[PDB]
Amino acid sequence: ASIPHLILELLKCEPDEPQVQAKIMAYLQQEQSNRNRQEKLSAFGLLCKMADQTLFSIVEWARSSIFFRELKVDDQMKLLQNCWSELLILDHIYRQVAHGKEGTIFLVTGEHVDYSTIISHTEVAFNNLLSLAQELVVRLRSLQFDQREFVCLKFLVLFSSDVKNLENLQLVEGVQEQVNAALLDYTVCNYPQQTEKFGQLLLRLPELRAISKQAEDYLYYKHVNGDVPYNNLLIEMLHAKRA
């Protein structure tokens, strides 16, 4: 049940999980408690701020990471500018593998909702999306997945060699192949009869790069209706990457 040297230290870069929900939830509870004669948010706008924080936290997790620390900002921001969505989604997905179950969605704030109560209270465009995610959350919980192969993936997404302009291309070249192997070992090591599990996990990647695009397109659409908060980070992240 032992894990290679790589994954062992990768688990060290984890954000905690109690520490965050305290931060975020207290922030949000603070955001609404805030005194603006105008500006309700409200359900949606506020959820964007949640997603923002998540992304903030995700960036801390990134900068506060061993292989990420080396390689300087200019490039740091280029990796982020590519996967910021894919990661933001994935985080949610896993959170639904860990604390997700029946018809119940678990937010990063530690709150939960009824998938039915959600789907009805949301527009179709957002259903074709949440469902698209669940399709994957479940598809995959089935394949016996957990925090070990999870963090492997995070780095895999974050360090996609399929970028463009950067100097330390060699570093990503390295970790992209250094984590592919590191994962391959763990595949059969701490697990029973999967055989092609590695290929399966590595397979669900584009199936998430795809849920991403559609998610962004949704953001842009909601943004262009004005529904998205003022200094929001996602729309910001979207304009850098988009154009």
């Binding site: 527009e123 179709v124 949704y218 659409y221 262009v224 209706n225 529904d227």
Partner: protein, 181 residues
């Protein structure tokens, strides 16, 4: 006349929907919304195409609804009467396509803006040539005022029943938007 006109009534319907479908600010729509629009704007937008192509056609003792018939008639004439140029016809179509009033919309503020930029880019065209804004402006709004009385149930019976025979112009639409996707 029936096969003659209905044959080209569809050549406009398609000429219309294509114009709309391949519209960039239109691609940005969840389809369910992207449809809400078309599910209404189609009848008018159609008339504007036909009136732009000077589609002449007469009737015979072909059915009864008269007010419905006389309204269409009055519309095409008021249009031709106003010598509506190409650009003007375009900007008119947009005006029809985007109205935030439609029930079921989730993006009111978005189309309101579009609605705005349309009458904006339209005013500029007027500025460029025909002066006396309130004149050419209230003039065109007259054409639009006529569309109000069209039902779009009648338009169906008139140009499509003879060719469609019961498939609806609901089942039709859905196909169109995704067909050429």
């Amino acid at each position: 006349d029936p096969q003659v006109v209905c044959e080209a009534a569809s050549a406009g319907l398609l000429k219309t929907l294509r114009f709309v479908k391949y519209l960039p600010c239109f691609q940005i729509l969840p389809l369910d919304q992207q449809l809400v629009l078309v599910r209404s704007c189609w009848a008018p937008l159609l008339m504007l195409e036909l009136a732009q192509d000077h589609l002449h056609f007469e009737m015979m003792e072909h059915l009864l609804p008269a007010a419905a018939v006389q309204a269409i008639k009055s519309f095409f004439f008021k249009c031709w009467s106003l010598n509506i140029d190409t650009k003007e016809y375009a900007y008119l179509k947009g005006t029809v396509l985007f109205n935030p009033d439609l029930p079921g919309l989730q993006c009111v503020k978005y189309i309101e803006g579009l609605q705005w930029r349309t009458q904006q880019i339209l005013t500029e065209h007027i500025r460029m040539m025909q002066r006396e804004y309130q004149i050419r402006s209230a003039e065109l709004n007259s054409a639009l005022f006529l569309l109000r009385f069209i039902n779009s149930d009648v338009v169906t019976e008139l140009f499509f029943r003879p060719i469609i025979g019961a498939v609806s112009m609901d089942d039709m639409m859905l196909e169109m938007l995704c067909a050429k996707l």
